[PDB]
Design an enzyme around this catalytic site. Structure first.
Site, PDB file in Angstrom:
ATOM      1  N   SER A 197       0.848  -1.294  -0.099  1.00  0.00           N
ATOM      2  CA  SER A 197      -0.063   0.197   0.139  1.00  0.00           C
ATOM      3  C   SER A 197       0.981   1.710   0.202  1.00  0.00           C
ATOM      4  CB  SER A 197      -1.218  -0.183   1.376  1.00  0.00           C
ATOM      5  OG  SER A 197      -1.907   0.786   1.128  1.00  0.00           O
ATOM      6  N   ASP A 246      -8.112  -2.686  -7.507  1.00  0.00           N
ATOM      7  CA  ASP A 246      -7.013  -2.253  -6.586  1.00  0.00           C
ATOM      8  C   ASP A 246      -8.305  -1.039  -5.583  1.00  0.00           C
ATOM      9  OD1 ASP A 246      -4.902  -2.198  -4.486  1.00  0.00           O
ATOM     10  OD2 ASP A 246      -5.965  -0.303  -4.236  1.00  0.00           O
ATOM     11  N   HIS A 273      -6.745  -5.636  -1.761  1.00  0.00           N
ATOM     12  CA  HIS A 273      -6.249  -4.772  -1.464  1.00  0.00           C
ATOM     13  C   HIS A 273      -5.227  -5.331  -0.328  1.00  0.00           C
ATOM     14  CE1 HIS A 273      -3.619  -0.599  -1.653  1.00  0.00           C
ATOM     15  NE2 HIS A 273      -4.258  -0.703  -0.094  1.00  0.00           N
TER      16      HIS A 273
HETATM   17  C1  LIG Z   1      -3.936   3.257   1.111  1.00  0.00           C
HETATM   18  O1  LIG Z   1      -3.354   3.288   0.165  1.00  0.00           O
HETATM   19  C2  LIG Z   1      -2.271   4.052   0.303  1.00  0.00           C
HETATM   20  O2  LIG Z   1      -2.223   4.304   1.012  1.00  0.00           O
HETATM   21  C3  LIG Z   1      -1.473   5.042  -0.303  1.00  0.00           C
HETATM   22  O3  LIG Z   1      -0.417   4.690  -0.776  1.00  0.00           O
HETATM   23  N1  LIG Z   1      -2.420   5.301  -1.886  1.00  0.00           N
HETATM   24  C4  LIG Z   1      -4.000   6.101  -2.181  1.00  0.00           C
HETATM   25  C5  LIG Z   1      -4.045   6.400  -3.474  1.00  0.00           C
HETATM   26  C6  LIG Z   1      -2.580   7.314  -4.187  1.00  0.00           C
HETATM   27  C7  LIG Z   1      -2.451   7.789  -4.620  1.00  0.00           C
HETATM   28 CL1  LIG Z   1      -3.225   8.346  -6.303  1.00  0.00          CL
HETATM   29  C8  LIG Z   1      -0.926   6.993  -5.178  1.00  0.00           C
HETATM   30  C9  LIG Z   1       0.554   7.222  -4.308  1.00  0.00           C
HETATM   31  C10 LIG Z   1       0.010   6.173  -3.360  1.00  0.00           C
HETATM   32  C11 LIG Z   1      -1.380   6.443  -3.083  1.00  0.00           C
END
Ligand SMILES: COC(=O)C(=O)n1ccc2c(Cl)cccc21
Ligand SMILES: *[C@@H]1O[C@H](CO)[C@@H](O)[C@H](O)[C@H]1NC(C)=O
Length: 349
Positions: A146, A247, A293
């Site tokens: 993530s 995702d 996820h």
């Molecule tokens: C739960 O997911 C995260 O915590 C996460 O890292 N993200 C969630 C959207 C996102 C984008 Cl649009 C770019 C880079 C990282 C991102």
């Protein structure tokens, strides 16, 4: 409870609230493989939403309540039954307590209520591990799920450069980015979208991005480098990309909440096709057609298969490729079917 907590000896490298960052470690004597895993858990990009996170997600902003041990699961498990890939490796879990997608380099001070030190936490963990056996490593796999998977993309080359400058050119730094490959696409219903939030975060965090990517997009546009398909071509370290085609975090930031009618069916199908397109030239990748996820630290991460190959097998094939394609040992595994759970091995929920 096999991984032991070590708080950073350099206590100026801190979680959001100024408490020391740290890492959990389970050493494997005589293994020269090191797995450094970056935890995920969203982010916060202003005082108000960071204050809210501090109230009800405080372990993601502070080490004060961390347990002294954690159990390694999935790719962090030391049992071959659970982790066919790297069960004998030295295992490191780096808690996410900087809320900055591992990009920050700003201390808590007179002007800053919170410290955002994710990029520096990684460098300091690497530095302190060298004295605990990392100096003898042959492979350092920087992995993450993530926000931690995006963190791999942002930091894997900086780890490689750090080890090169410290006099350890023999350590092969590699990346494994799980569920950190997002699209800056249109929301299904048009509050801060997946672009503005990162834009504000970079300023609020003093966030840093890989140098080649920074040089392409230049000042004010570094938010682009948080998006896998833009930052990946600039990276020099080998990076294996794991990404569900549908995702759940991508759908969340797209304002999709799951009888699906035509507009939403087309939206979801287009999203899978776009994700699949962005991976077409990623040689080491695992992208199942599932609504889910994260995967690599789940205990049942061995269950999902693409074209009959599990992720632990794909990663082992990747290892072999880094010793022409290998007979029956593929590394590029992207589903082509166009709807969630058209792959029967998808996680059941
Ligand atoms: C739960 O997911 C995260 O915590 C996460 O890292 N993200 C969630 C959207 C996102 C984008 Cl649009 C770019 C880079 C990282 C991102
Ligand atoms: C502690 O970390 C800070 C920030 O990364 C760095 O400037 C400083 O040199 C470090 N101090 C020691 C003693 O390692």
């Amino acid at each position: 409870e096999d991984l032991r907590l070590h708080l950073l000896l350099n206590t100026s490298v801190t979680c959001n609230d100024g408490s020391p960052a740290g890492y959990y470690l389970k050493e494997s004597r005589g293994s020269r493989r090191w797995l450094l895993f970056l935890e995920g858990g969203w982010y916060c990009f202003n005082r108000e939403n960071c204050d809210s996170r501090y109230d009800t997600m405080r372990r993601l902003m502070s080490s004060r309540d961390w347990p002294r041990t954690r159990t390694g699961t999935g790719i962090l498990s030391s049992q071959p039954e659970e982790n066919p890939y790297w069960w004998n490796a030295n295992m490191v879990f780096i808690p996410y307590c900087s809320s900055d997608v591992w990009s920050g380099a700003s201390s808590k001070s007179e002007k800053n209520e919170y410290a955002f030190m994710g990029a520096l936490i990684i460098q300091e963990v690497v530095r302190e591990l060298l004295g605990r056996g990392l100096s003898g490593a042959k492979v350092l796999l920087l992995a993450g799920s993530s926000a931690g998977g995006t963190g791999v993309l942002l930091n894997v080359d900086r780890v490689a450069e750090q080890l090169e400058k410290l006099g350890y050119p023999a350590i092969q730094v590699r990346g494994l980015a799980d569920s950190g490959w997002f699209l800056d696409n249109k929301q299904y219903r048009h509050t801060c979208a997946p672009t503005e939030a990162i834009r504000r975060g970079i300023r609020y965090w003093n966030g840093v991005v890989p140098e080649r990517c920074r040089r392409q997009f230049q000042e004010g546009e570094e938010w682009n480098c948080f998006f896998g398909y833009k930052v990946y071509p600039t990276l020099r370290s080998p990076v294996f990309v794991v990404q569900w085609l549908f995702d759940e975090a991508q759908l969340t930031v797209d304002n999709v909440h799951l009888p699906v009618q035509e507009g939403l069916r087309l939206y979801i199908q287009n999203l899978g096709r776009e994700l699949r397109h962005t991976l077409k030239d990623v040689p080491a990748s695992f992208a199942p057609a599932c609504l889910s996820h994260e995967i690599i630290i789940r205990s049942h991460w061995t269950d999902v298969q693409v074209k009959g190959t599990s992720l632990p097998r794909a990663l082992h094939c990747w290892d072999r490729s880094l010793h022409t394609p290998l007979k029956g040992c593929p590394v590029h595994l992207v589903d082509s079917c166009p709807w969630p759970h058209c792959n029967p091995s998808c996680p059941t929920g």
